[PDB]
Amino acid sequence: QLSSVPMLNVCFNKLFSMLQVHHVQLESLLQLWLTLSLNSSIFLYNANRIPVISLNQASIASFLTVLAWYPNTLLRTWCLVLHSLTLMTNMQLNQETTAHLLVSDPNLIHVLVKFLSGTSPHGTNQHSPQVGPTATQAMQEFLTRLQVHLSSTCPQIFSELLLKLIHILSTERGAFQTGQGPLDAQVKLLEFT
Amino acid sequence: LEQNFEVVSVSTISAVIESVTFLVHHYITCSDKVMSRSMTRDQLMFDLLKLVNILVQLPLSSNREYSARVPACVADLVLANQQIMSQILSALGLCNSSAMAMIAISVGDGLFTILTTLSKKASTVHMMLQPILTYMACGYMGRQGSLATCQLSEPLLWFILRVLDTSDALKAFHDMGGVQLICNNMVTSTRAIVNTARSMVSTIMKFLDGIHNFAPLGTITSSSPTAQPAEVLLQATPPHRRARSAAWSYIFLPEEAWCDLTIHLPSAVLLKEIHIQPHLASLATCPSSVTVEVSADGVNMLPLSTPVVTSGLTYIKIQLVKAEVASAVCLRLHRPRDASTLGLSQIKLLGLTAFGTTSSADQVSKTSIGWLRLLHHCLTHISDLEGMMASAAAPTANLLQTCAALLMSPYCGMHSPNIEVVLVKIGLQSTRIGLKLIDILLRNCAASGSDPTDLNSPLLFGRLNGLSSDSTIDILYQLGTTQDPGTKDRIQALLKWVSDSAKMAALKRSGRVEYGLLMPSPSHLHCVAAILWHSYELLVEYDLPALLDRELFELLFNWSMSLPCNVVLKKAVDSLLCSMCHIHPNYFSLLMGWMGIISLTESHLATLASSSQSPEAIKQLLDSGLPSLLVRSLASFCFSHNKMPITADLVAPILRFLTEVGNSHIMKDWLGGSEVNPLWTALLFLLCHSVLTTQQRTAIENATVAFFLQCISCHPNNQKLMAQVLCELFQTGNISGFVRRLFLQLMLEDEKVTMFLQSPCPLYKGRINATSHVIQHPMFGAGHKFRTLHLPVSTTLSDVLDRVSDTPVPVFHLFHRLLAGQPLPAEMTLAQLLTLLYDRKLPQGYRSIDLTVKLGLDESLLETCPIQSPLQVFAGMGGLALIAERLPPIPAHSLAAFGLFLRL
Amino acid sequence: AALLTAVSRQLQDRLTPLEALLQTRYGLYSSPFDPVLFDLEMSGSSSDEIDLSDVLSFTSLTGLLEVEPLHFTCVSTSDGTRIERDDASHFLQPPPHQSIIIERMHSGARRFVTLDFGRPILLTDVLIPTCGDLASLSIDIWTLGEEVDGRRLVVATDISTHSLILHDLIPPPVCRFMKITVIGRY
Amino acid sequence: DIQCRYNLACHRLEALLQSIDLPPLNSANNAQYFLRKPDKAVEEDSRVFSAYQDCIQLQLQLNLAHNAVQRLKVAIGASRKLLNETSGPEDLIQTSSTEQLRTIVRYLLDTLLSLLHSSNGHSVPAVLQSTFHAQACEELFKHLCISGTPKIRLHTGLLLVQLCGGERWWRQFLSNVLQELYNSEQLLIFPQDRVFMLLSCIGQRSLSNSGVLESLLNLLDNLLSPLQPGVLDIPMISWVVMLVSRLLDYVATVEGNQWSFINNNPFTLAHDRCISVVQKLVLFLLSMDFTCHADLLLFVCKVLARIANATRPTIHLCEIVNEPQLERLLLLLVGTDFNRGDISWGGAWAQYSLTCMLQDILAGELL
């Protein structure tokens, strides 16, 4: 009879709180949250889908900080990040919308730089510097959902965030000058700007 | 690496060591999920580790600001820095055994060499021990208060063994408290880890039904409408070489850069390797880069890694470091770099399913066994520090339950006998620990806390109570036979367990912790009986007749009478009764008082024989005249077809009773006595050589052949008497069926002798990886030290020593009590040895040959003639000519002639 | 029901632990220790258990104990098909399976094999397995003369989907030679 | 002569049978012994196969020779064995051969299966209720299924389906039969697995009534009752959980699949009876350690999800688990305590089963 949605909110907010102290792994928690929010919604991922599991402001801030210093974030950890961040742009917080929380957070620009300058830092095997089509599409839907959610409220902050992204990539010791990072994701970001 | 660093500043060396250590730890901890194989950055990291190895060997100057111009070393400052040592120990922890097994081309060998050089160049031993203790205490990221332990890999385990090799390192390890921390980390990791053994679920699924391709079961789809269906790519048959035509060809539009191939497996399987075969005739059509998308749900593709460059490869093999479930696999293939067409020969998805015949074809890190490997090394490396390590491991809660669960788990990296040694020394440290270990093995095997609500306390639920294996038999036997103070309390606990099991069986019969008393192991009861027999034989200091109780003997008698005769548990209780009759001669007289002998059934006769296997009970049974009464009444029943009536159903239990009591040598001499001599010819007259029904006749036939074979077994005057009886039978037309039964099985089958081996070194070849209940006599004992083999007399001693142990240089040498201090040759057989022993003090027809195996006139023993077979004595008496007369691709004329010359 | 219950109780009483060990470990359910055997049945021949998933979603030869298995030798000439073996003490041993192999089969025609027992017997049981390749089958038996005392045992147009089964021959014929004519499907 | 050779074969087979040990599948070590099939056991089983083949061939030759001897005795003029009305029927059953008893019971089972297939209403007036009660059905099921051949066992099982499907005690019969046969306290040496496949089939034939699975769940929550605050045993609880899973899968077939990886290739139960079963299953899921296996965790997840979707009010995730217990369950899913780096808690299969478990519960609640 009682809805189990608020208990799931409490325990997932707890897990996102213990993300900072290395108590829980990031990529498995993101996969679990995405799987539950996708099935409860039927199975297929859609950008026009509100998650059933609601995360607080401190959970998103801890997630962005953990991403802001996560060493050698793998590429499909990054795709889990992009799909999850799209779903938190769909997510309502109980004020300020969560897309405004994402763009207003200073860690998101470092997240985007670390994605666009990731390349293959381990270099264990010979790999292409491009990220493939799926990561490019996921980044495109994430930026599109940011644009849609902040067109009415404040598009100037999103435009300034995009310009700061291009500025940080385009300076000296950057991804644009050194040639590192995906070409496809940077080209799609340029087309979106 | 070629340069030498002499007067370089210390701060530069420390910065280099810290930065390279962090870089190598970042390289090892962060690796791609997809590995693909067709100078290297592994060589770069290994040369960096070689540079750190050179830098830690540098001597240090007195001012310590700069290195020595040319005691103090740079390795001391490496040991002082906690971050560098934590990163090195963690980086060796994430390394598997596959990288280290090259022992030095990989980075794990570089970390091992750096750590070994740090151990060698340490100023004091405690300076090397302190980061190790910090890494054990910290866990994963310094976390405490939860079910978190640091991951111990096999290379890291080997490094800690090489650190704790020296005696001062072990003493400093106890001074730091590392033994308690190892035990607590063992308990918490055993609580945290669930076993991945295949268990009994996979057995039922295997009956109800190294990596296999699942591409033919799947269906391949492409989102491009112009693409071919590509179903030939999923075929299991590989395309032939130089086919000159692509199996599937895709035409690329100029705007299109990626082509997708999507394979939907019918069920989700574990996926390990993906093999893509390009067109061999033209590698221009080979894809430039391939990325792999997998999906556990099958509709939402979460891919694996970055796109792998596949240009100029005849075969694309994509291998996952981590096997992941995938019900659907999608493959995005890039446009070729030069050609505009995509040529694929075959696509293979290699993996394993769960729950089937396809579910078939590092353990230190997965399980909690490496902590007990360290505990075993600390206990058994040096005997002087052994007691003080065992006193260190004593106050740890739930250690014995964890060690027993690791003992009877499947093999997870370390063999069961060393687990047994750890359990023996922990139980032998104190009397309370010994009684606790006896309680765990027999009555209650569960955690002392036993709190499922707490969810962080250890719990040992899931292990069956009172469960037996050969390991626990060895634990109980070594606890019983050890003559340390507190032994009497352990024997009292064993006898209390036996008494409580008998009372629980009585209450089960009445129909009114508890599971161990409800189900006793027959092997455990036989082990208790063997402990009692060998402690009575050893003349122990504690009074073993005082520990035995008359009411316990009565309870065991009623429990043995209640069980059916075919039950193994009745044989175990009868072995306990035999041990108590051996220790107490009055117990056997009280037993015959219960029998009423001054109405016998089959369980009565079985209990009488098994309790009368002991020689004092042999003497008392011979003095009571019970086998005399049975032999006269049996001869009367034979003549029919003080006297006692014998029913026809009772006859074969009487013969079985006579066989089992005639296992002994005194009653072997008694069956050659003048009273029993009419019985053999009377049995031959009873069976009539073709009244009794057919099934009764067949059963009494088998029992008569077994009885005569037990009578004549390596007893030369008995087989001489049997030859006299048989030649008198043959002298008095054609060969009957039971006569041929007797001749073949009694006469032409070679005689087999029971043989008992005693070795101080434990023998492990005969033991297997299952539980079994083989009830034997309590003089033979139990455990890996004692072996019993039932072998023919033609078998050599070399085959015996090969059967008891592999022994692939110290050599095991066979020894005998009569042959004191004289080695036995491997070339002789058991028959020549029996001839020698019958020449010496050992009586004819002994129960078992006693051989002593100790690790390191023989030709005169080889010249000794073997024991004559019953065939040899029978043909020496001349009955072979008699059976030649009575008898009615080898040629048949050879056989007919051979019979005619057997007449001669 | 009452006879079923009583004979079931006695059948439980007949069981020995060694035969039960054979049943639970090797899947062998016939009793090897008991010398007496009541009946033998042969319906389809070349651990035994039934597939409980497939069945739970025939006619058998009965008797087979006073009669004797008989070795046969194809010393008589056969046209169109040769006899190859699949890879009274001698008669008490079972005969080997000798499946006939045609080097070329061609539809809607006639072929036959011919066999000899070597001595006159009384033949009572015929078991021919069903063969979906074949349309019709017939067998001709004779003794003394080839056609003087020749008699046809059976005509079988049912050989495609039914086995040719003769449970007993009530006038038991005296036979030494047989031929079996096989006709393939159209 | 054939009797002499047969008796020689029987003696060597009896000695070879005394050479054999057999583990009772009480632990995972005996299970691994059955899974490995070691080469010493292989050569022992090959020797048993050779000796048994010699015994059965020589027994068949002896019986053929004996009936030929009896036929020639008839040919002389001696009559066969004449039957006596003075002899009682009980000694007539007693003196008869074992294979004669098997053939008689087989023909009686075929005849009774023909009676239950009657043209007049598909019913039997007396044996449906009066002749077959619970005690007689249990005893006859035991005597023909532990001791009998698979054919006669299958026929008497389907016969007992026909007679006692309509009785209300069929569910208690099946739960009791499974409990006494598969108990670790039981010492009956019988093929457990073929009887288990028979038990799955005999559950499937009466599966349209929900009472059989209800009684199985009542048995299952009776077994997990030590775990809620007793002695708990893995094997027979695993037997019960497999029977429940196979019956629920057969329900899914008669009515792709999220639980297809566990497969090799009016039913709706009440909530208040099921909730204790599912809560004890959650406690068993959280209470696994190195003594337990993830191999039972797959079935606990599958059974728990199928029961949670099976009830007419779908079991919410609130009452199935406590909030610290749910936090613990996600710690088993995500968290460096239980899966560390490359190492996964119970492998990838256990984590996938836990994910599909939570997926099925949330899909049942939200629908």
Numbering used by the authors:
A (entry chain A): 2618 to 2658, 2669 to 2721, 2731 to 2829
B (entry chain B): 2830 to 2867, 2899 to 2930, 2963 to 2995, 3015 to 3120, 3145 to 3296, 3307 to 3457, 3468 to 3553, 3590 to 3632, ...
C (entry chain A): 1448 to 1493, 1506 to 1516, 1531 to 1560, 1752 to 1850
D (entry chain A): 1909 to 2137, 2147 to 2172, 2184 to 2193, 2306 to 2407
Question: What is written in the article reporting this PDB entry?
Answer:
The gigantic Inhibitor-of-Apoptosis Protein BIRC6/BRUCE/Apollon inhibits both apoptosis and autophagy by promoting ubiquitylation of proapoptotic factors and the key autophagic protein LC3, respectively. BIRC6 promotes ubiquitylation and degradation of the mature Smac and effector caspases by serving as both ubiquitin-conjugating enzyme (E2) and ubiquitin ligase (E3). Although BIRC6 is a gigantic 530 kDa protein, only two small domains, i.e., the 8 kDa BIR domain and the 19 kDa UBC domain, were previously annotated.
To characterize the structure of BIRC6 and to understand the structure-function relationship, we expressed and purified the full-length mouse BIRC6 using HEK293F cells, and determined the Cryo-EM structure of BIRC6 at a global resolution of 3.6 Å. The overall structure of BIRC6 is organized as a symmetric homodimer in a U-shape. The two monomers interact with each other side-by-side in an anti-parallel fashion, forming a very extensive dimer interface. The central section of BIRC6 is responsible for dimer interactions mediated by an armadillo-repeat domain (ArmRD), which is composed of 31 armadillo repeats (ArmR). The major component of the N-terminal region is a WD40 repeat (WDR)30 β-propeller domain. There is a long insertion between the second and the third blades of the WDR, which folds into two structural domains, BIR and a tightly associated domain. This domain mediates the indirect interaction between BIR and WDR and thus termed BIR-stabilizing domain (BSD) hereafter. All the three domains, WDR, BSD and BIR, interact with the JRL1 domain, orienting the BIR domain toward the center of the U-shape structure. The C-terminal UBC domain is highly flexible and completely invisible in the density map. In summary, the Cryo-EM structure reveals the domain organization of BIRC6 and a central space for potential substrate accommodation. This anti-parallel arrangement of two monomers would bring close the two sets of functional domains (such as BIR and UBC), suggesting that BIRC6 dimer could work either in cis or in trans to fulfill its role in substrate ubiquitylation.
